[PDB]
Design a protein around this ligand. Structure first.
Ligand code: NA
Ligand code: NA
Ligand code: NA
Ligand code: NA
Lengths: 488, 488
């Protein structure tokens, strides 16, 4: 319903009373998250500049503060000591210059000689509304104050279309690299384009990273390389990916691909996995960003929200939130994802669980449910449920001869992008035990499966009185239920 | 420098870009607090609606979001599980109606039949800019959504001047009471005026509370009655208080007075203390609010900021912050104040201290320093200090034959309201031990003295590289130093 004109009206052409009203509307929503990052107002999307700098973790965010739509984008800024307790540092990069006049699009952060370089795509629209993407290196100092250059670091080359964006800047092998999402101008295929520099002033093209002969969609958004247990891992968003390469049910997938090795100078990637895999088996994770932290861990955080999609909270004038931070691990040839240790600080009111069918008549809106379920069983676990289990988030499990998990949100509340399905299925190994570590926060659910082997993340919109947690059958299991304190 | 006109321009007449800029400027200030409540933008003052409701603690705030000045006021809203980890719920009450057209001034919160009543003063300015104060009862529901009535609960009576405000609404002795700060129209003296109701619709005047024959300033702002260990305790701001009643050095004092008993129907107060005493012996505490919580504790929180005063951060376009929450206790005929238990969750990097002269060469900007100092000593403890101790926050102590504590902020940085003195003195008992529990957070220091017997709270503005903590003499003491994590 918003016009192009309305989406690109400048922030100075909105009044401050409207913005204050919008902050109240977002914060007091009955569906707001309160231990995950959420917009102060308007729409949140792609994590940006995820980093460690000046003694704390930093995280920036694509933001449009005036409504539940992809209006003209800015970066806003959060920091944390522990990847859990975030505090707001305000807007960081506005669409206020020629280079980014129609948006400060996504990007990354790299420490350099005591400053934090923020490299991002200036979404420029020229006099005719032709998009010209510019790669810009801004600079943040130790007071979190940001300066912008007057000139781009990388001008759009001839071989790419208008889609050329989301730079990842980092140091590796003694030099500087930039990875960019790209659509080839002639084939219209998605690529990760490689740039290298020895000084950050002159950039050299190394070409598209060789991901094999098969096309990777028509565009790759938000490319990421991180080293996880010494393996090069790609995390990226290949829009239009052929489902023959990998199944997925979201409108656009967020894939990962573990390599045995990578050579950015020669644009070479030796895959460990024969195929890329879904980072998240759920309903809503997109634009995930990751970085290698000084503590030797690789951390990732996801936008929970999909482009070209809508949500029942749209009428509340705000949209989406972030996943919790996930610590990455390579195990058995796959990517595992784990809650960070600090998230346990939110826990309180611990309850021991052993075979009780009804886990809680009324669990609250914020909790962590950690379960161990014996092999050889089938049933349903209902979350955010009414009393008779007819309206809930359903985890339909089988740990017996056709083992699998089906997550079904159809009955949880109003429909959520139903054209892309009300269920998601995760295959399980037959006759094996099952672990679940389930985080519920307002209209967000995160289901960590078999100790991080799979993660299923989703929005759901249950009426506030639907807070029951219960199995439908007598189920043999042990577990713990904790309330989780509001911090955001 | 701001004109009346500029201070009362409506929020809708500011643009949203300016507000976003101001949020960044406040949040990224090198002097910002990060484990105390601080404005998101502009100026913060008086705590309001401090309460427990709908399963969490609530706190509201006088706010002017567009600069470091007392522009037209609104309430904004925070909540917390534990009085430490606060999260922002946005604006709550705007100056958007006839009754509050020149400000939604301070007030209180009272739970009533599943709602939270917010009773506050509408600062009305009529056609001639005559101030007409109205007492308004708004209502908040379980989604933190607020409705405003069209009519005042209490119209200004004939016997009070234009100064008649800051209602405290509560239930006691089976009926409802409202305590209001008042200036008598004929004598121009400060009073706490009492109203009572059996239904919240019809209010009856019980008269001024009898605080004795001596005048209590020319106005009492922010009156509070709380029961602490079953004693009635008044906490209030008597502007113009004669210093013969009690010494104080701040422009306006924040006093407390313990009674043996109180009878609100008969406007009677039997004092326990012969005289009211300073709630805070420091430089900046004002407009403290308190309430009786369901856990059986009385809690208080203070504005750190004084009216008609200025601060070095004024040029940064933001102003002031709150104290931490203080749990109240009556002991030995005095009011004791304690950090809440949950504040210990911020602690990390614990260091044991035993007689070391230099406690830390560089302590960081956020810490808690807890010390036990033997009787019979004299010296100085320097906080936020440069290396040679010439620029610091000075705690000059004597625990020997003329025992006392002098807190001196003159050398800490730029002058802070110097007309009201650069030192504050707290008398101590001769030849007694001394305990200190010191909280530093950005430009805020809170010094709890002898286990809460006295509290000295102050702003200070040290250069960021001045972080040494050291005694000047060999001092015998034991202690602990903890870093405190940023949460806000
Ligand atoms: Na590690
Ligand atoms: Na769905
Ligand atoms: Na108690
Ligand atoms: Na001073």
């Amino acid at each position: 319903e918003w016009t192009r004109e309305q989406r690109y009206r400048k922030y100075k052409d909105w009044d401050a009373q409207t913005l204050l009203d919008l902050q109240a509307q977002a914060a007091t929503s009955p569906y707001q998250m309160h231990y995950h990052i959420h917009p102060l107002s308007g729409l949140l999307n792609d994590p940006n500049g995820f980093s460690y700098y000046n003694g704390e973790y930093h995280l920036f965010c694509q933001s449009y503060p005036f409504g539940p739509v992809h209006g003209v984008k800015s970066w806003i800024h959060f920091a944390s000591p522990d990847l859990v307790h975030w505090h707001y540092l305000g807007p960081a990069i506005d669409p206020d210059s020629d280079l980014d006049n129609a948006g400060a699009y996504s990007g990354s952060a790299m420490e350099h000689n005591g400053k934090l370089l923020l490299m991002y795509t200036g979404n420029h629209r020229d006099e005719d509304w032709t998009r010209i993407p510019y790669q810009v290196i801004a600079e943040m100092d130790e007071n979190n104050h940001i300066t912008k250059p007057d000139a781009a670091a990388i001008l759009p080359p001839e071989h790419v279309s208008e889609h050329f964006r989301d730079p990842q800047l980092f140091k590796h092998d003694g030099k500087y690299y930039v990875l960019l999402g790209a659509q080839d101008a002639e084939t219209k295929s998605g690529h990760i384009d490689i740039y290298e520099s020895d000084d950050l002033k002159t950039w050299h093209e190394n070409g598209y990273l060789d991901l094999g002969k098969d096309e990777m969609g028509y565009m790759i958004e938000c490319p990421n390389l991180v080293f996880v247990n010494n393996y090069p891992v790609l995390i990226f968003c290949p829009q239009g990916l052929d489902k023959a390469i990998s199944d997925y049910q979201n409108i656009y997938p967020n894939m990962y691909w573990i390599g045995k090795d990578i050579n950015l100078n020669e644009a070479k990637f030796t895959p460990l996995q024969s195929h890329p895999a879904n980072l998240d088996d759920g309903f809503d994770v997109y634009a995930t960003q990751a970085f290698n932290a000084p503590d030797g861990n690789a951390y990732a955080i996801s936008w929970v929200g999909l482009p070209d999609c809508t949500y029942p909270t749209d009428k509340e004038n705000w949209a989406n939130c972030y996943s919790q931070v996930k610590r990455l691990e390579i195990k058995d040839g796959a990517l595992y994802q784990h809650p960070v240790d600090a998230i346990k600080n939110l826990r309180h009111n611990e309850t021991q669980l052993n075979d009780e069918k009804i886990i809680s008549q009324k669990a609250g809106k914020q909790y962590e449910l950690k379960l161990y379920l014996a092999a050889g069983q089938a049933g349903k676990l209902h979350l955010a449920s009414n009393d008779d289990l007819s309206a809930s988030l359903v985890i339909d499990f089988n740990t017996a001869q056709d083992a699998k998990l089906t997550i079904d949100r159809a009955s949880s509340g109003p429909a959520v992008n139903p054209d892309y399905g009300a269920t998601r299925t995760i295959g399980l190994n037959d006759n094996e035990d099952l672990d679940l570590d389930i985080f519920v926060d307002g209209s967000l659910c995160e289901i960590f499966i078999n100790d991080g082997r799979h993660v299923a993340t989703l929005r759901f919109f249950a009426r506030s009185s639907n807070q029951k947690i219960a199995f439908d059958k007598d189920t043999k299991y042990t577990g713990r239920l904790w309330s989780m304190n509001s911090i955001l």
